[PDB]
Write a protein that binds this DNA or RNA. Sequence first.
RNA 1: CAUUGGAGAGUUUGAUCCUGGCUCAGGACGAACGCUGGCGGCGUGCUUAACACAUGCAAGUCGAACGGAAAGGCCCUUGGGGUGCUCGAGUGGCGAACGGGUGAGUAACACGUGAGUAACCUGCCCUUGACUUUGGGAUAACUUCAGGAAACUGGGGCUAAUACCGGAUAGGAGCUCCUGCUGCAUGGUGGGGGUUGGAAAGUUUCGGCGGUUGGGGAUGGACUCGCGGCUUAUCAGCUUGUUGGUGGGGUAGUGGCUUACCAAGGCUUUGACGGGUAGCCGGCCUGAGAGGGUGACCGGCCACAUUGGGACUGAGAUACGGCCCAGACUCCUACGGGAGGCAGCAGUGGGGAAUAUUGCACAAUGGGCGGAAGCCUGAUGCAGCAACGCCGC
RNA 2: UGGUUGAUCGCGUCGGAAGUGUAAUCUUGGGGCUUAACCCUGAGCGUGCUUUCGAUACGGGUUGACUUGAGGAAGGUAGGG
RNA 3: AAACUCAAAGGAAUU
Lengths: 200, 128, 90, 87
Amino acid sequence: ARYTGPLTKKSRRLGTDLVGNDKSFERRPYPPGVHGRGRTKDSEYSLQLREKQKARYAYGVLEKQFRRYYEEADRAQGKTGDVLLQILESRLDNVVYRAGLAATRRQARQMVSHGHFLVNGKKVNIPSYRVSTHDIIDVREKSKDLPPIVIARETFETRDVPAWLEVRPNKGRILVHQLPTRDQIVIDVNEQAIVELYSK
Amino acid sequence: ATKIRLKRLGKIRTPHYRVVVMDSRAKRDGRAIEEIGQYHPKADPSVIVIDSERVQYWLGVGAQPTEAVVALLKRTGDWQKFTGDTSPSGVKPQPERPNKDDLFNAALAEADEAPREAITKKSEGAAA
Amino acid sequence: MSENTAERTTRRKVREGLVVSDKMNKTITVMVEDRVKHPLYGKVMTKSVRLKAHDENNEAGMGDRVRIMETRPLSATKRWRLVEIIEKAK
Amino acid sequence: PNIKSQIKRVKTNEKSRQRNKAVKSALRTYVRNFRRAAEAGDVEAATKAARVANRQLDKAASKGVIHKNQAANRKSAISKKLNSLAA
RNA sequence: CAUUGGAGAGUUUGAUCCUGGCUCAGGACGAACGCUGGCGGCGUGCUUAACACAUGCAAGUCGAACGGAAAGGCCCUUGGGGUGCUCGAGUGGCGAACGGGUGAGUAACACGUGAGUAACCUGCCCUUGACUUUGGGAUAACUUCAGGAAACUGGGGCUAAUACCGGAUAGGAGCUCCUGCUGCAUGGUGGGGGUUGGAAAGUUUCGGCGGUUGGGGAUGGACUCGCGGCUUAUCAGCUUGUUGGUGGGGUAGUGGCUUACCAAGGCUUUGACGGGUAGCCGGCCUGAGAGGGUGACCGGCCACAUUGGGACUGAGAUACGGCCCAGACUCCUACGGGAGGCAGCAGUGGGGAAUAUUGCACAAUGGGCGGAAGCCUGAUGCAGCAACGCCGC
RNA sequence: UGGUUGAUCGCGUCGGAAGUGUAAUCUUGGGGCUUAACCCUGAGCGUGCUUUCGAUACGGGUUGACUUGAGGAAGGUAGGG
RNA sequence: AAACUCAAAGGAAUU
Ligand SMILES: [Mg+2]
Ligand SMILES: [Mg+2]
Ligand SMILES: [Mg+2]
Ligand SMILES: [Mg+2]
Ligand SMILES: [Mg+2]
Ligand SMILES: [Mg+2]
Ligand SMILES: [Mg+2]
Ligand SMILES: [Mg+2]
Ligand SMILES: [Mg+2]
Ligand SMILES: [Mg+2]
Ligand SMILES: [Mg+2]
Ligand SMILES: [Mg+2]
Ligand SMILES: [Mg+2]
Ligand SMILES: [Mg+2]
Ligand SMILES: [Mg+2]
Ligand SMILES: [Mg+2]
Ligand SMILES: [Mg+2]
Ligand SMILES: [Mg+2]
Ligand SMILES: [Mg+2]
Ligand SMILES: [Mg+2]
Ligand SMILES: [Mg+2]
Ligand SMILES: [Mg+2]
Ligand SMILES: [Mg+2]
Ligand SMILES: [Mg+2]
Ligand SMILES: [Mg+2]
Ligand SMILES: [Mg+2]
Ligand SMILES: [Mg+2]
Ligand SMILES: [Mg+2]
Ligand SMILES: [Mg+2]
């Protein structure tokens, strides 16, 4: 119920950097496997499916839960892709990643599932915990000196925190100013393509 | 006989009762003549909401309460208004009150010791 | 003088119809027509039902437009009573 | 029966059936006596029989062997017949 | 004075366009099978044989109605005190008609929806007005006798009640006569008069708890009715208590419900009658919607309880764990005769592609009885089992 | 199924009001289970029905006109009807 | 009518 295999293979297949940089993605222009350099047809399904899989492997969400997110966004009022990206960003592991306390979303999932975090006073070990507005995520007092935590404390200045979060790095406290908007989620997929895909 | 009793609802190991009016012969979780209130005992200082006018009407028309409903009416004070007896009538204590916006504004500004205990944990990694 | 809750309110059902059978004693078969939409195609249809009324004195004849009021079961099939004759077509 | 309550119940049901049957048969005999007096056309005999039958109908209704509505219906029939006989 | 919602593809030809069927991508399931299988949360789990069922349990309770004393318990040289609590068996009250199950039957006022009863009944509960009077005869238990393999049955004797039966006294019960106001035809209702009548129960640890009868309330049920939801015309005639009338009977109640007499009706191509299938619905699945399919869990109504029929008792009965008769089955028998009904819970056999434990507890909620402590509750709350579903890790 | 039009009824139709459409489900707002599923709670929905009060353009009922549709009279008239 | 069977049958037109 969690993808544990290599991520560079998925990034190469999907054609975009799922996470990180300056890595084995120097072989980017071609998917993994023996048949990587051949010319591709890329149907509309192919395109749509690529966008959906890009979002899925970026956020570490499997198909059933991603589908559930899709119906929630579709029911919600407003743009379906905007709401879907808003939900995926409101996931707690992504919140930790965006605040910059984790090197990657996989590391954020690791620490969240291991329970190194407090949500507004209550301990949460659910990576899919949907953080609500005005929430206060806190690092567990016992685990305020994790090696990944201190690496993040050394590196966060380079990292860019989105406008909808406030982070007290050394304190391990992520204040949620508001639930993010499409202009605030970084554009790296085609949510419109995903929405069109979930209609066929 | 017409009874004022509790109709069980909710999950396994999580009961919420509806103080309802139905005759004795009816099954426990069935059609009720009228729904009077609710009773959540699983919650802190159990929630006890009883419609005073309706419960007074049904007591005056002759509905027989079950012992549980008698306890709830004692706590709501209805069991004293009807069948006047010297009982404490301990109207439910509230199950306290949290808040979110005030805490967020308190911490947004908290700043100071936020990043301050934060550089103290910097000294901690030093200690780490 | 001071009678109980008067009015009784509770009014009974009234139907206007056309007499289609008067050849049994103290009984007239009344045909009552109603117009309703078709459930699927929406056209306004004409639904007709035969109602047996009780006509004391046999005062109504074939083709007479009559008014009937519902009653308690007066026989195996009669449940209505004649209350007036509106047009005596004859 | 399989339940001792039900065995007790069949015994008491038989007992109550005996009691009720006796009372109903007495009621029928009294009403028949009144009917035969009425057919014979006597006035004093029919009056006495009607009084007896109505009293016994009310007594049975009180005892619960018959419903009070049934007692009232039979009494009404008897009294109407006696009135017709007198007229 | 805007919308929350609609995707196609392949395949007839040498090629084309159209028509057109077929097939596929989606969703779903009370599913099964194959491979595989870590955990948790919440659900769900005989859809077939309404097939036949071993075993345990699923409806009892009350000594503050009664005689009592077979147990335990106190007091006494082992029996004895019924003496106090207690208490088998027995009378008596209430409950057993609820809860729980199943979907065979039913194409029907069964159900959905909305009304009517001036045609209705309603134990326990609430409320209000009157009352709770005077007598009597039995009987179970017990005892004795006889019969029976048993199930049990019949005599003799004996005994108590809130058991049973006379009487008196009580309206809004019958009949009848005035009179006020009135409805929807039968009528409803207020007032007065005549006449004939209808009840009851006592008990206590003195704190209680009960009895009868009028009138209202609440609750539950009953019947009637308008409208609505299958298929079949390769089913066209159906009906004779059938349709209506009058008198009687019956019933809680209207009614051919029943009966006697009289009449000849009633229904039907707008589909009667017959055949097929089916419990109905809130809902469920699907769908842009309109619709189409469906009726598991849960909830409402109905029907049924081995098959067929019948009543009895009761406030109330398709009376699941009642009775009677018959049929088919199973069991006991000393051959004379007896006993039984898991579509209650768990379980077995069987059928099947396929569906679980012969579990724990009355702690909670609900129910029955008791003045109460309390007793009973396979309702229910839980646990076991299965990736069967959903969700999370 | 219905040409033009006067009057009237208010059945269809349309608009209010009251009653009903239990609960659960479902949609949605809040709340609780660490999240979710699930659960509680407020509202909507319950697409109808009954009662009642209005409106009268249209459909229909009742009733009266008009002649253009339709038919008839008189005259004319073609034809292997 | 049905079982059964086919993945076409067919219309107009083009070369
Ligand atoms: Mg005799
Ligand atoms: Mg009579
Ligand atoms: Mg061809
Ligand atoms: Mg080809
Ligand atoms: Mg005993
Ligand atoms: Mg049932
Ligand atoms: Mg069912
Ligand atoms: Mg008595
Ligand atoms: Mg019908
Ligand atoms: Mg008659
Ligand atoms: Mg069937
Ligand atoms: Mg259906
Ligand atoms: Mg059910
Ligand atoms: Mg009876
Ligand atoms: Mg029974
Ligand atoms: Mg039952
Ligand atoms: Mg049984
Ligand atoms: Mg079973
Ligand atoms: Mg098998
Ligand atoms: Mg209890
Ligand atoms: Mg108690
Ligand atoms: Mg028991
Ligand atoms: Mg016209
Ligand atoms: Mg006009
Ligand atoms: Mg709700
Ligand atoms: Mg929450
Ligand atoms: Mg509802
Ligand atoms: Mg007209
Ligand atoms: Mg001519």
